[PDB]
Design an enzyme around this catalytic site. Structure first.
Site, PDB file in Angstrom:
ATOM      1  N   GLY A  69       3.209   7.236   9.083  1.00 51.67           N
ATOM      2  CA  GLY A  69       4.567   7.297   8.756  1.00 51.67           C
ATOM      3  C   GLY A  69       5.276   6.218   9.017  1.00 51.67           C
ATOM      4  N   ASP A  71      -0.428  -7.554   2.116  1.00 52.18           N
ATOM      5  CA  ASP A  71       0.299  -6.307   2.194  1.00 52.18           C
ATOM      6  C   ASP A  71       1.642  -6.120   1.960  1.00 52.18           C
ATOM      7  OD1 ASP A  71      -0.153  -3.165   4.080  1.00 52.18           O
ATOM      8  OD2 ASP A  71       0.583  -3.351   1.837  1.00 52.18           O
ATOM      9  N   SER A 124       4.106   3.021   8.368  1.00 52.10           N
ATOM     10  CA  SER A 124       3.985   2.024   7.284  1.00 52.10           C
ATOM     11  C   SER A 124       5.181   1.485   6.414  1.00 52.10           C
ATOM     12  CB  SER A 124       2.875   2.735   6.303  1.00 52.10           C
ATOM     13  OG  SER A 124       1.719   2.540   6.899  1.00 52.10           O
ATOM     14  N   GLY A 125       4.954  -0.053   6.392  1.00 49.15           N
ATOM     15  CA  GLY A 125       6.123  -0.704   5.859  1.00 49.15           C
ATOM     16  C   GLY A 125       7.393  -0.976   6.631  1.00 49.15           C
ATOM     17  N   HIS A 175       0.855  -1.215  -0.130  1.00 43.02           N
ATOM     18  CA  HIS A 175      -0.075  -0.033   0.100  1.00 43.02           C
ATOM     19  C   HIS A 175       0.878   1.174   0.054  1.00 43.02           C
ATOM     20  CE1 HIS A 175       0.635   0.069   4.513  1.00 43.02           C
ATOM     21  NE2 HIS A 175       0.508   1.304   4.257  1.00 43.02           N
TER      22      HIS A 175
END
EC number: 3.4.21.1
Lengths: 34, 239
Positions: free
Chosen positions: B187, B99, B189-190, B54
Protein backbone atom coordinates in the site's frame (compact mmCIF):
# COMPACT_ATOMS: atom_id res chain seq x y z
CA UNK A 1 6.81 -18.82 3.12
CA UNK A 2 8.17 -21.41 0.71
CA UNK A 3 9.01 -20.86 -2.96
CA UNK A 4 11.34 -21.97 -5.75
CA UNK A 5 14.68 -20.13 -5.26
CA UNK A 6 15.23 -17.24 -7.66
CA UNK A 7 11.89 -17.94 -9.34
CA UNK A 8 9.85 -14.88 -10.33
CA UNK A 9 6.34 -15.68 -9.12
CA UNK A 10 3.31 -13.46 -8.64
CA UNK A 11 1.48 -12.96 -5.35
CA UNK A 12 -1.97 -11.35 -5.27
CA UNK A 13 -1.50 -8.23 -7.39
CA UNK A 14 2.20 -7.85 -6.63
CA UNK A 15 5.07 -9.71 -8.31
CA UNK A 16 7.96 -11.28 -6.42
CA UNK A 17 11.32 -12.97 -6.87
CA UNK A 18 11.86 -15.94 -4.57
CA UNK A 19 14.83 -15.65 -2.24
CA UNK A 20 18.07 -17.50 -2.90
CA UNK A 21 16.89 -19.85 -0.15
CA UNK A 22 13.27 -20.53 -1.08
CA UNK A 23 12.48 -19.28 2.42
CA UNK A 24 11.86 -15.63 1.52
CA UNK A 25 11.11 -13.28 -1.37
CA UNK A 26 11.08 -9.66 -2.54
CA UNK A 27 7.81 -8.15 -3.77
CA UNK A 28 6.46 -4.87 -5.08
CA UNK A 29 4.43 -3.00 -2.46
CA UNK A 30 1.02 -2.31 -4.06
CA UNK A 31 -2.28 -2.66 -2.18
CA UNK A 32 -4.52 -5.42 -3.51
CA UNK A 33 -8.36 -5.41 -3.38
CA UNK A 34 -8.19 -8.99 -2.08
CA UNK B 1 8.35 23.81 -3.11
CA UNK B 2 9.23 21.56 -0.19
CA UNK B 3 8.03 23.88 2.59
CA UNK B 4 4.68 22.77 4.09
CA UNK B 5 2.36 25.51 5.38
CA UNK B 6 1.67 23.18 8.29
CA UNK B 7 5.07 22.21 9.65
CA UNK B 8 5.43 18.44 10.25
CA UNK B 9 6.52 17.09 13.63
CA UNK B 10 8.83 14.09 13.73
CA UNK B 11 9.56 12.28 16.98
CA UNK B 12 13.01 11.09 15.99
CA UNK B 13 4.59 1.58 7.08
CA UNK B 14 5.50 -0.77 9.93
CA UNK B 15 6.53 0.76 13.27
CA UNK B 16 5.84 4.29 12.12
CA UNK B 17 3.72 7.00 13.73
CA UNK B 18 0.67 9.06 12.85
CA UNK B 19 1.51 12.33 11.15
CA UNK B 20 0.21 15.81 11.83
CA UNK B 21 -2.76 16.34 9.47
CA UNK B 22 -1.75 18.24 6.35
CA UNK B 23 1.98 18.31 7.21
CA UNK B 24 2.94 16.33 4.05
CA UNK B 25 0.95 18.38 1.46
CA UNK B 26 2.39 16.68 -1.63
CA UNK B 27 1.25 13.18 -0.61
CA UNK B 28 -1.59 11.93 -2.81
CA UNK B 29 -3.55 8.71 -2.94
CA UNK B 30 -4.20 6.80 -6.15
CA UNK B 31 -7.64 5.19 -6.23
CA UNK B 32 -9.60 3.02 -8.66
CA UNK B 33 -13.19 3.48 -9.83
CA UNK B 34 -14.50 1.78 -6.68
CA UNK B 35 -12.57 4.16 -4.44
CA UNK B 36 -9.96 1.57 -3.46
CA UNK B 37 -6.53 2.98 -2.55
CA UNK B 38 -3.84 0.93 -4.30
CA UNK B 39 -0.80 3.25 -4.46
CA UNK B 40 0.64 6.52 -3.19
CA UNK B 41 2.23 9.40 -5.11
CA UNK B 42 3.65 12.94 -4.93
CA UNK B 43 2.60 16.26 -6.48
CA UNK B 44 5.55 18.03 -8.15
CA UNK B 45 3.53 20.99 -9.50
CA UNK B 46 -0.08 21.95 -10.17
CA UNK B 47 -0.50 19.70 -13.21
CA UNK B 48 1.74 16.67 -12.49
CA UNK B 49 2.01 13.72 -10.10
CA UNK B 50 4.94 11.30 -9.86
CA UNK B 51 4.53 7.67 -8.80
CA UNK B 52 5.83 4.14 -9.51
CA UNK B 53 5.57 2.46 -12.90
CA UNK B 54 4.66 -0.91 -11.36
CA UNK B 55 1.51 0.62 -9.88
CA UNK B 56 -0.01 0.30 -13.35
CA UNK B 57 -2.05 3.51 -13.27
CA UNK B 58 -4.52 4.17 -16.12
CA UNK B 59 -6.57 7.19 -17.20
CA UNK B 60 -9.46 5.48 -15.45
CA UNK B 61 -7.93 5.86 -11.98
CA UNK B 62 -8.27 8.90 -9.72
CA UNK B 63 -5.81 11.11 -7.81
CA UNK B 64 -6.99 12.24 -4.36
CA UNK B 65 -5.13 15.22 -2.87
CA UNK B 66 -5.33 16.87 0.56
CA UNK B 67 -6.32 13.69 2.40
CA UNK B 68 -5.32 12.50 5.88
CA UNK B 69 -7.94 10.07 7.17
CA UNK B 70 -9.25 7.81 4.41
CA UNK B 71 -12.18 6.73 6.56
CA UNK B 72 -13.45 10.29 6.93
CA UNK B 73 -16.01 12.10 4.80
CA UNK B 74 -15.66 15.63 6.18
CA UNK B 75 -12.21 16.56 4.85
CA UNK B 76 -11.74 19.14 2.11
CA UNK B 77 -10.14 16.90 -0.52
CA UNK B 78 -9.66 17.18 -4.28
CA UNK B 79 -10.50 14.31 -6.64
CA UNK B 80 -8.53 14.86 -9.82
CA UNK B 81 -8.94 13.10 -13.17
CA UNK B 82 -5.96 11.91 -15.19
CA UNK B 83 -5.29 13.17 -18.71
CA UNK B 84 -2.28 11.08 -19.76
CA UNK B 85 0.01 8.46 -18.26
CA UNK B 86 3.73 8.64 -19.10
CA UNK B 87 5.55 5.46 -18.10
CA UNK B 88 9.35 5.54 -18.30
CA UNK B 89 10.37 3.71 -21.48
CA UNK B 90 13.26 1.96 -19.72
CA UNK B 91 11.08 0.37 -17.04
CA UNK B 92 11.94 -3.31 -16.71
CA UNK B 93 9.03 -5.30 -15.28
CA UNK B 94 11.34 -8.22 -14.46
CA UNK B 95 14.02 -6.33 -12.54
CA UNK B 96 11.69 -3.52 -11.42
CA UNK B 97 14.32 -1.02 -12.59
CA UNK B 98 13.62 2.58 -13.63
CA UNK B 99 10.40 2.26 -11.63
CA UNK B 100 8.88 5.66 -12.37
CA UNK B 101 5.71 7.01 -13.97
CA UNK B 102 4.37 10.54 -14.55
CA UNK B 103 0.70 11.49 -14.47
CA UNK B 104 -0.59 14.56 -16.29
CA UNK B 105 -3.81 15.74 -14.60
CA UNK B 106 -6.82 16.69 -16.75
CA UNK B 107 -7.61 19.39 -14.19
CA UNK B 108 -4.97 21.39 -12.30
CA UNK B 109 -4.73 21.01 -8.52
CA UNK B 110 -5.61 23.98 -6.29
CA UNK B 111 -2.72 24.68 -3.95
CA UNK B 112 -3.53 25.60 -0.36
CA UNK B 113 -2.19 24.88 3.12
CA UNK B 114 -2.85 21.13 2.74
CA UNK B 115 -1.96 20.81 -0.94
CA UNK B 116 1.39 21.89 -2.42
CA UNK B 117 4.45 20.50 -4.26
CA UNK B 118 7.58 18.64 -3.20
CA UNK B 119 10.95 19.74 -4.64
CA UNK B 120 12.89 17.72 -7.23
CA UNK B 121 16.68 17.24 -6.90
CA UNK B 122 19.41 17.88 -9.46
CA UNK B 123 20.95 14.82 -11.15
CA UNK B 124 24.30 15.64 -9.54
CA UNK B 125 22.87 16.06 -6.06
CA UNK B 126 24.58 14.21 -3.25
CA UNK B 127 22.47 12.47 -0.62
CA UNK B 128 25.04 10.73 1.56
CA UNK B 129 24.55 7.32 3.12
CA UNK B 130 23.64 7.66 6.78
CA UNK B 131 21.43 10.69 6.20
CA UNK B 132 18.14 10.51 8.10
CA UNK B 133 15.21 11.02 5.72
CA UNK B 134 11.42 10.46 5.80
CA UNK B 135 8.90 8.19 4.05
CA UNK B 136 5.09 8.44 4.30
CA UNK B 137 2.01 6.40 3.35
CA UNK B 138 -1.21 4.49 4.05
CA UNK B 139 0.38 1.05 3.79
CA UNK B 140 0.14 -1.78 6.35
CA UNK B 141 1.38 -1.05 9.86
CA UNK B 142 1.38 -4.74 10.77
CA UNK B 143 1.15 -8.09 8.99
CA UNK B 144 -4.00 -4.00 9.45
CA UNK B 145 -4.54 -1.12 7.01
CA UNK B 146 -4.35 2.37 8.59
CA UNK B 147 -7.08 5.03 8.27
CA UNK B 148 -4.62 7.86 8.88
CA UNK B 149 -1.43 8.84 7.09
CA UNK B 150 1.65 7.36 8.75
CA UNK B 151 5.25 8.66 8.72
CA UNK B 152 8.68 7.26 9.60
CA UNK B 153 12.29 8.46 9.81
CA UNK B 154 14.98 6.16 8.42
CA UNK B 155 18.60 6.31 7.17
CA UNK B 156 19.73 5.98 3.57
CA UNK B 157 22.17 3.13 2.85
CA UNK B 158 24.91 2.93 0.23
CA UNK B 159 24.30 0.53 -2.64
CA UNK B 160 27.38 -1.41 -1.55
CA UNK B 161 25.86 -2.06 1.86
CA UNK B 162 22.48 -2.81 0.29
CA UNK B 163 23.94 -5.46 -2.00
CA UNK B 164 24.97 -7.34 1.14
CA UNK B 165 21.23 -7.86 1.49
CA UNK B 166 19.90 -8.02 -2.07
CA UNK B 167 22.87 -8.90 -4.25
CA UNK B 168 22.55 -8.39 -8.00
CA UNK B 169 18.97 -7.09 -7.69
CA UNK B 170 20.26 -3.64 -6.75
CA UNK B 171 20.73 -1.56 -9.90
CA UNK B 172 22.20 1.93 -10.19
CA UNK B 173 18.73 3.49 -10.56
CA UNK B 174 17.85 2.23 -7.05
CA UNK B 175 18.53 3.49 -3.54
CA UNK B 176 17.90 1.70 -0.22
CA UNK B 177 16.84 2.91 3.23
CA UNK B 178 15.66 1.36 6.47
CA UNK B 179 16.72 -1.84 8.22
CA UNK B 180 16.59 0.34 11.32
CA UNK B 181 13.31 -0.60 12.98
CA UNK B 182 10.75 0.57 10.43
CA UNK B 183 9.61 -0.77 7.06
CA UNK B 184 7.60 0.21 3.99
CA UNK B 185 4.80 -2.27 3.30
CA UNK B 186 1.87 -3.16 0.99
CA UNK B 187 0.00 0.00 0.00
CA UNK B 188 3.06 2.24 0.38
CA UNK B 189 4.17 1.78 -3.27
CA UNK B 190 4.63 4.94 -5.33
CA UNK B 191 4.90 7.01 -2.18
CA UNK B 192 7.76 9.40 -1.34
CA UNK B 193 11.09 9.09 0.43
CA UNK B 194 12.16 12.68 1.22
CA UNK B 195 15.27 14.35 2.62
CA UNK B 196 15.75 18.00 3.52
CA UNK B 197 18.27 19.84 1.36
CA UNK B 198 19.10 23.48 2.09
CA UNK B 199 15.90 23.88 4.10
CA UNK B 200 13.44 22.25 1.66
CA UNK B 201 12.05 18.69 1.49
CA UNK B 202 13.26 16.99 -1.67
CA UNK B 203 12.11 13.79 -3.38
CA UNK B 204 15.04 11.34 -3.43
CA UNK B 205 13.17 8.04 -3.63
CA UNK B 206 9.88 6.43 -4.67
CA UNK B 207 8.67 3.33 -2.77
CA UNK B 208 9.41 0.41 -5.12
CA UNK B 209 9.88 -3.00 -3.51
CA UNK B 210 11.23 -4.94 -0.57
CA UNK B 211 10.76 -7.78 1.91
CA UNK B 212 7.53 -9.71 1.27
CA UNK B 213 7.03 -9.73 5.04
CA UNK B 214 7.97 -6.10 5.62
CA UNK B 215 10.84 -7.15 7.89
CA UNK B 216 12.18 -4.20 9.90
CA UNK B 217 15.72 -5.58 9.71
CA UNK B 218 15.92 -5.55 5.90
CA UNK B 219 16.36 -2.33 3.88
CA UNK B 220 13.54 -1.20 1.60
CA UNK B 221 14.19 -0.46 -2.08
CA UNK B 222 13.22 2.79 -3.84
CA UNK B 223 13.68 4.23 -7.32
CA UNK B 224 16.61 6.69 -7.15
CA UNK B 225 15.14 10.02 -8.31
CA UNK B 226 18.54 11.61 -9.10
CA UNK B 227 19.05 8.97 -11.80
CA UNK B 228 15.62 9.73 -13.21
CA UNK B 229 15.19 13.54 -13.03
CA UNK B 230 16.49 14.27 -16.52
CA UNK B 231 13.76 12.03 -17.94
CA UNK B 232 11.18 13.88 -15.84
CA UNK B 233 12.39 17.26 -17.09
CA UNK B 234 12.31 16.19 -20.74
CA UNK B 235 8.80 14.81 -20.36
CA UNK B 236 7.54 18.00 -18.70
CA UNK B 237 9.26 20.22 -21.27
CA UNK B 238 7.51 18.35 -24.06
CA UNK B 239 4.01 18.43 -22.59
Amino acid sequence: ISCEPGKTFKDKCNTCRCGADGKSAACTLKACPN
Amino acid sequence: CGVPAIQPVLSGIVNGEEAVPGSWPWQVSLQDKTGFHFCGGSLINENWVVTAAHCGVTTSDVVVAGEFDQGSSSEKIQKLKIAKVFKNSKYNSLTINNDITLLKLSTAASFSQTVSAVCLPSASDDFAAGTTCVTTGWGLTRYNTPDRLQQASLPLLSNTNCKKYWGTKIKDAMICAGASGVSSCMGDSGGPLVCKKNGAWTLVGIVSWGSSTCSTSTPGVYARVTALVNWVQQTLAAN
